[PDB]
Each structure stands twice: as C-alpha cells, then as structure tokens.
C-alpha cells in the first residue's frame, strides 16, 4: 500500500506517477525518522512511517546528490544538496545502490 501513503501525503502531486520507492530514514541532527523515499518524474519525496515529518523537492531544486562514503557495516546514506544550500540526509537504505540509481535517472533526465 505504499502508493496510498504517497497519495495521502502529497495531494499536490496527484498527477505524478510513482516510479519507485525505497525504505530509508531521514536524519536531521540527532533526530531520525524511518519512512519512505518516493521517486516521481518531477519530485523527490519522503514521508515518515510513524510521524508527520515529510518533504518534497523538485529535481530542478537539487544541486547535487552524493552516495556518502562509509566504512561502517550498517550505515548506507545518500546526501541531497539543494540550490538554496540546504542538505538533506537520507540513511538506513536497504537498497541504496538501487535508490541512488533511480534518483540519478530522474535528476539527470
């Protein structure tokens, strides 16, 4: 029912097809929120599984996407840098390589 989460959380994106989705967590400082990364043709979105916290960012707002270096077994993060110089930290991916590839495909057009 991942589509239902998307359609409830992002009604402004009701015309967007859901191309892919990934389990991960949004981390901001000391706060971690487990949730879902959604990839649509124009938007990168996240909704927390058990909390209100969510975001949506257009690919034309994204300056860079980094597959974070790690020598730790269970850390698997992606960093999203915006043109407004914000940084979004996504962690705890089960399929980080696949997520990163799916991101590249839409961001690089």
From TrEMBL:
- Signal peptide position in this chain? none
Question: What is the protein named?
Answer: Uncharacterized protein
Please name the taxonomic classification of the source.
Eukaryota, Discoba, Euglenozoa, Kinetoplastea, Metakinetoplastina
Part of the intact protein present? 621 to 729 of 730
């Amino acid at each position: 029912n991942i589509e239902g989460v998307f359609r409830k959380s992002f009604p402004d994106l009701a015309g967007e097809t859901l191309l892919d989705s990934f389990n991960c967590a949004w981390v901001e400082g000391s706060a971690l929120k487990q949730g879902y990364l959604f990839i649509t043709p124009h938007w990168l979105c996240f909704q927390s599984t058990l909390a209100a916290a969510h975001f949506s960012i257009e690919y034309d707002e994204i300056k860079d996407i980094i597959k974070s270096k790690s020598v730790k077994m269970f850390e698997n993060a992606i960093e999203v840098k915006t043109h407004l110089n914000d940084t979004i930290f996504l962690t705890n991916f089960l399929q980080r390589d696949q997520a990163y590839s799916a991101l590249m495909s839409q961001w690089l057009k």
